[PDB]
Design a protein around this ligand. Structure first.
Ligand SMILES: CC(C)C(=O)OC[C@H]1O[C@@H](n2ccc(NO)nc2=O)[C@H](O)[C@@H]1O
Ligand SMILES: CC(C)C(=O)OC[C@H]1O[C@@H](n2ccc(NO)nc2=O)[C@H](O)[C@@H]1O
Ligand SMILES: CC(C)C(=O)OC[C@H]1O[C@@H](n2ccc(NO)nc2=O)[C@H](O)[C@@H]1O
Lengths: 533, 533, 533
């Protein structure tokens, strides 16, 4: 007993020192492994060295910003005062310079490019103007968020699309994600057998969802997802000027689904303003989760375009939310509270994986059931429309025919050519009435037909569309904005914050419209920047 | 801002006028389409014209009955008083006339028909007498509901079965329903692949359930299901004399399942009397839902017989409930409250479809699990019974052998011939211990063997049975009365009305017996009316 | 009415007499059937006669012990006092005799057996010593439970393994269970089609779980499971000296899973001590359910070893729980309350089957989801470890390689030979990080390779291992102790007794370690008793 007591006392004495010592030993062992690998053959060992270097750089940066924050603020203070003193005369100069730059760039580049892209820019203008017309509080609007959002979208798009180094990186990331979920496809062979490929959607696509949920929960427990979310949220906050919680939500949505995103700010959901709740719902509707990314890349959709669309959507979502529905009341929630996100209550990584996996049981079931019902309804609608058409001697009438004409103007404004606008309109109709999955499937079919080659027109029917139309379509459909999505979103938001039910419902409706408009804006920018093949 | 305010004021001014104007414009466009179709080719366009005419007639009738209700009641009042004044002497005359008519019809028709059907009528008498013997409150019974229920069953059966125009209509309706769920079968190919037919029950039959649930929810939101329920309920109410809620429930059950039917009167479930709760449960047990109709018609079961059985069951269910368990306490619920049914709380048709689809997730899982367990138990029972029989030198002993002899008297009383009564008894045993699905499958096998042709007896074993036996079997098995059904029914009823738990449990037991007896009565009438092949 | 009243009065008069009369008539009919079968052909009829005889014997024994308990206690009292008076000097004599017997048996048998088994005994000693070192309350420990637990394990193992009559019985029982769940496999063909074998795990293995749950619920309603649990619990109670509830739990766990076992003492869970809760969790972790037994026997695992391991585990679980974590507080719960187990609230056998089946819906879903996620994670881990290894010119690095070396000492102490210890270590790693299902699958592969024959080493890689190693592996892996299991166990225990949350969590962690150690002890004993092939 005495020896055990002495050992316990020794353990109590060295607690912090012992933990630091063991962590340091582990890190030193990792560094030794890295250096041995570099010694033997540097060319193979390069990735590990790069990862270690970037991690060290980020840790050093974080520590310095923490400790030296006051000194940096002191250094920055004089310049802010000097800018404020001269701001009155300088604001006009800055605005004029920006306008002149816009004019020069637009003329030279896009005029050397063609008409369709000039039309894309016109569509950008039209969408923004319309949102300003039908805003909830048109008189009181802050234009800095809108302008900065559009500018940031343009800069990101320009870098990623018109530069070779930028283009290669996203391709690499897409390949990584695709392989990462391919690891999932193999793991599900055990449960459903080697004949799981017989039923593709049920035994490949949904298991991908399951694996993604588990991985995300583990990373949440470790504390990485949070880091990336905080960085991007701080960027948006320091530039767009939005409130804290909405920026945090938007950054999270980039790689998180609509249902799980509000849980980031769950504790403060009761106290949020109506505008911030609208922003949350709009961000949820305007961006897709990471789970669907691997599947969509597998279909044939470009990885670079999908990732760029997801990244660009969040700033656009916030900008459109502010313009469509601006804030009229003071925000209670503080920056420190919002940025802080409570970690999982579980006790070990494996418990977090288990809990994350169990939650997915509901989502998959609801998805499968809704798909069954809505596709059956589409079949009934097509058969009945054909029956009605036969009366007027047009037996070819179908859902696709009405939705081609109804949605054509939106496609034309986005910069798609006249011939392909109808084909894009069919996909938009599929996205709005049904999930983006069906629409992406149809798009993949058109892409595959283009790649195989053959007659553009088998008969007076066009078979495949041009590459640029496909890129614009990729941007236009990268959202969770559906009518069934509206219901589940409302239900979840009401669950988390029972007090705010009616505010949640009212936000939902306008939010979905804002999300679709935000999705259109990214497509307009992509059309402006992508060259005609 | 001023222009927006002026537009909002103009919108506020014209609200009702604008809505009426747009609805009128839409209706006029529909009528123009109809008339154009009729102009070009009337023969093709006939269905649309017929639908429009009947819809207009019903709307006019409803409006007139609403506005002119007082005047019609005033016109009707004198005749009621005149009848009441002379009722004392006239009641004996009416009863004698009815008895004489019954005797004459029975003699001529059924005597020219044969012995089996006279036995069917005898079975009708026997079942009613037995229910009167074992009633909860034998002394206090109202005979008008019982007699009127039997009479209405007889009239409906006579019209539908012995008249050619009546026979054709139900065949047409069955074909419509079969095609309607065939639309479902196609829609489920997407999720489970084109090899979904490999697993027939899992990937065809259950998806049919899903599609039916979605369609029913949409129609509920639109407000059609409610209209039909109200019409049939009013008929039963004005003739049978039952209380409001039970009539409403019975009309709904005709095409609604046992689990969803009480939700029609959910708000008033706490306050219902014991007799009305027994009536609800009996109606639930005695009738089948619309989802199973398409499958059962697909197996080979006749559409006309299935639909006629479902329609006839509800009046029989109410009559048997009253005779078996009569009311001893005053009914609180009013007609207006009961007939009114709150519409779905959802916000658009698509939300209603989503919500209806999500609910079906539980039902399908429970069905599949119960089927797995109970069929495995049947296998074990057969193997053990064979093992026991081998001891006594009868290795052929099985579940079917015991259940052939045990249930034979019921089949004989229904009018089935002696040879086929055993075969029907096996099916009845399957229905009672297991769901009607298995029993209908066996019945379909026997029907198919009859249609193929061949030896009636391969050896001293009969292979197929006569057509009339199949019709009587179709009527006898059209119910949800099983022991597993008893449990889920009790659970759901207890959930909706927690206060009434014990009353719910006591009602359940007697209710199932009443339901089975009601199912037998329809078969007796069918045997009386169907001719010997 | 009067006749009904007279009949009701007559029924009231004869209630108990009538029930006894009918039960007696049924029993007499059963006996007549037995005697007729014996008359015709005794050889065939033997099983029924044996069952009847044993049932009669047990009923007579129970009745006599009930009625004559006081007289038997009176007879036993004098001997207890005489033993107590002389106990002071006699305890040393008894202990010395036991030690001498242990020495003689060990020397003769195991010395004539070989080194490996002497090492097995050494491993037994080592595990017990280590548990004594790291006990929660080392100073206060009661050694009688530990010693008696080890002794009872040894006696059961000796009888079952070294005697031919004992060996045959468990083989027979395993065949019975395997056929019993094979009945399940047939029943599931209806739902998933005859092509259900295409997806083996989803449509065979999980349906086995469903059928087992249903059968267990039915037997619980009838009252058999309870009888067996009570008998074994009384044995453990009268010998080990443990408290009532923990003994009852341990006996139940032998054939009940970790999740359902605490429901036996659900009403008293709030008031249990910390030590008893630790014992409950340890028993849950150290034993497997009956559902998995049929599957594991199907893989190729020996029936006799599996059943013996399950039986031996519970006494070991209690002993290890006491030594690892001893009780420091008085036990409130009484023997009578604990032994009594409330029967199911349902109303008939079929309701109990339905309720038992519905509960299984959650378990199967969670199992499938966790398997998908964890196997995908294993794939990712193997690929990344191979990538890291390629840097150091060892592309063969994998999960199995690390886990072979890490767990080798445990396998060596259990008595496995040096060459096969690594192979066993891989299986132990699979069991700890993933469910025992995967590990048993790998073990079945090794057994099948041994049976087929061929090169022991294809190259410097061993392909199959010796029979004794397989037996020790069978004992070592017969547990539910996994990390995912830890989470669900904690969740369920917290649900049943919300007051005890923190005590539940603290018990869980130590409990899992205790369970694994208990699993090792049974393997050590098996190695001591099994001869070298
Ligand atoms: C998931 C794929 C295979 C699919 O075909 O289903 C699409 C529907 O699934 C919703 N969805 C998706 C992911 C998520 N979190 O990762 N939460 C959601 O709600 C989403 O809105 C859409 O409607
Ligand atoms: C549904 C078919 C494919 C089947 O084989 O299953 C039969 C069992 O399903 C119950 N059932 C059915 C429909 C319903 N609402 O539409 N509610 C229910 O409870 C019903 O009682 C019976 O036992
Ligand atoms: C069941 C087989 C096919 C399987 O591969 O799954 C293994 C996992 O299932 C857990 N399990 C099992 C039975 C039970 N009651 O009978 N309760 C449980 O928790 C158990 O712990 C293990 O982890």
């Amino acid at each position: 007993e005495r020896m055990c007591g002495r050992m316990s006392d020794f353990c109590r004495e060295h607690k912090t020192t012992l933990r630091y010592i063991i962590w340091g030993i582990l890190i030193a062992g990792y560094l030794a492994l890295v250096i041995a690998a570099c010694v033997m053959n540097f060319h193979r060992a390069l990735p590990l060295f790069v990862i270690t270097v970037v991690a060290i750089f980020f840790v050093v940066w974080d520590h310095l910003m923490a400790k030296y924050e006051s000194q940096i603020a002191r250094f920055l203070s004089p310049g802010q005062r000097l800018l404020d003193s001269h701001w009155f005369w300088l604001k006009w100069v800055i605005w004029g310079c920006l306008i002149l730059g816009v004019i020069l760039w637009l003329v030279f580049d896009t005029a050397k490019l063609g008409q369709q892209q000039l039309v894309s820019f016109g569509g950008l203008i039209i969408y923004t103007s319309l949102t300003f017309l039908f805003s909830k509080h048109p008189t009181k609007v802050y234009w800095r968020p809108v302008f900065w959002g559009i500018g940031l979208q343009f800069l990101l798009g320009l870098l990623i699309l018109r530069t070779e180094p930028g283009f290669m990186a996203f391709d690499w990331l897409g390949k990584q994600v695709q392989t990462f979920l391919g690891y999932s496809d193999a793991g599900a062979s055990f449960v459903f057998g080697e004949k799981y490929t017989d039923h593709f959607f049920a035994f490949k696509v949904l298991p991908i969802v399951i694996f993604f949920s588990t991985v995300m929960s583990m990373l949440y427990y470790l504390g990485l997802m949070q880091w990336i979310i905080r960085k991007v949220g701080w960027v948006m906050l320091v530039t767009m000027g939005t409130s804290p919680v909405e920026s945090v939500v938007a950054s999270g949505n980039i790689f998180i689904g609509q249902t799980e995103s509000p849980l980031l700010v769950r504790p403060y959901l009761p106290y949020v303003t109506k505008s911030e709740l609208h922003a949350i719902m709009t961000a949820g509707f305007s961006t897709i989760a990471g789970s669907v990314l691997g599947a969509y890349i597998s279909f044939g959709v470009s990885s670079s375009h999908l990732l760029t669309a997801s990244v660009m959507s969040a700033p656009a979502a916030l900008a459109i939310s502010k313009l469509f529905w601006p804030e009229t009341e003071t925000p209670k929630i503080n920056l420190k509270n919002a940025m802080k996100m409570e970690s999982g209550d579980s006790r070990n990584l494996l418990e977090a994986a288990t809990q994350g996996a169990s939650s997915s049981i509901s989502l998959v079931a609801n998805i499968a059931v809704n798909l069954i019902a809505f596709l059956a309804l589409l079949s009934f609608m097509n058969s009945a429309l054909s029956w009605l058409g036969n009366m007027f001697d047009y037996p070819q009438l179908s859902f696709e025919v009405i939705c081609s004409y109804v949605f054509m103007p939106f496609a034309f404004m986005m910069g798609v050519d006249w011939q392909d606008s109808f084909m894009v309109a069919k996909l938009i109709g599929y996205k709005t009435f049904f999930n983006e999955f069906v629409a992406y499937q149809q798009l993949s079919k058109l892409i595959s037909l283009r790649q195989v080659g053959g007659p553009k027109f088998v008969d007076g029917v066009q078979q495949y569309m041009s590459m640029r139309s496909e890129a614009i379509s990729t941007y236009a459909l990268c959202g969770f904005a559906n009518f069934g999505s509206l219901g589940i979103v409302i239900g979840g938001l009401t669950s988390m914050a029972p007090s705010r039910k009616r505010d949640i419902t009212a936000g939902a409706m306008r939010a979905l419209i804002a999300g679709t408009i935000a999705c259109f804006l990214t497509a307009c920018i992509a059309g402006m920047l992508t060259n005609t093949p």
